[PDB]
Design a protein around this ligand. Structure first.
Ligand SMILES: O=C(O)c1cc(I)c(-n2ccc(F)c2)c(I)c1O
Ligand SMILES: [Zn+2]
Length: 197
């Protein structure tokens, strides 16, 4: 009833990577290594790199799922709030309840788990474009961390799993997410709080 968040590189040496976007007031997505935390604006592009040491088999897929970070909320399904699930901002593929979307990939599949009711979005693994050393997925987060009746100020983490064609685990990584109006300032604030602690 709670998905694992254990980092697991597995046989293929799977791990995530993030750009270095800085903390200017205008930034729309920025990752803090010190906090292992992505800060992003509502519905804006979040580039997440996938890195491996060796090529996984054809049919390998990459799944994203959100869970609440705090143990007393971990069993609650992370979903969009009562406002955003009704705002008809559909892309034709993502169910309106799903917090996490993949942008610009017609092969993205969205799962409502029949037993846990949790949401996830999964895409096929594709090799890097010629001249690149990693593959990038573009995610969108479709509610603010603060949305009442949804995340309601509770922190979440995104779990990224590398899976075989049956859905068996090959690799896992994760990061905390805050969806907020000013990710640059919030990253600076939280990094300073960490330093002061
Ligand atoms: O180099 C390759 O040949 C190569 C092949 C693949 I399929 C992938 N890959 C894509 C998504 C993922 F989770 C892993 C990657 I990243 C690669 O660097
Ligand atoms: Zn919302």
């Amino acid at each position: 009833s709670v998905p694992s968040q254990k980092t697991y590189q597995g046989s293929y040496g799977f791990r995530l990577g993030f750009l270095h976007s800085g903390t200017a007031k205008s930034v729309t997505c920025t990752y803090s290594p010190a906090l292992n935390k992505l800060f992003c604006q509502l519905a804006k592009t979040c580039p997440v790199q996938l890195w491996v040491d060796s090529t996984p088999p054809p049919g390998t897929r990459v799944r994203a799922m959100a869970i609440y970070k705090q143990s007393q909320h971990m069993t609650e399904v992370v979903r969009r709030c009562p406002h955003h699930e009704r705002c008809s901002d559909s892309d034709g593929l993502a169910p309106p309840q799903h917090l996490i979307r993949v942008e610009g990939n017609l092969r993205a599949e969205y799962l409502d788990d029949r037993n846990t009711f949790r949401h996830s979005v999964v895409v096929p693994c594709e090799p890097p474009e010629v001249g690149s050393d990693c593959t990038t997925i573009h995610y969108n987060y479709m509610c603010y961390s603060s949305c009442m009746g949804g995340m309601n100020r509770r922190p979440i983490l995104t779990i990224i799993t590398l899976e075989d064609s049956s859905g068996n685990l090959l690799g896992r990584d994760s990061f905390e997410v805050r969806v907020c109006a000013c990710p640059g300032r919030d990253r600076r604030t939280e990094e300073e709080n960490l330093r002061k602690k």
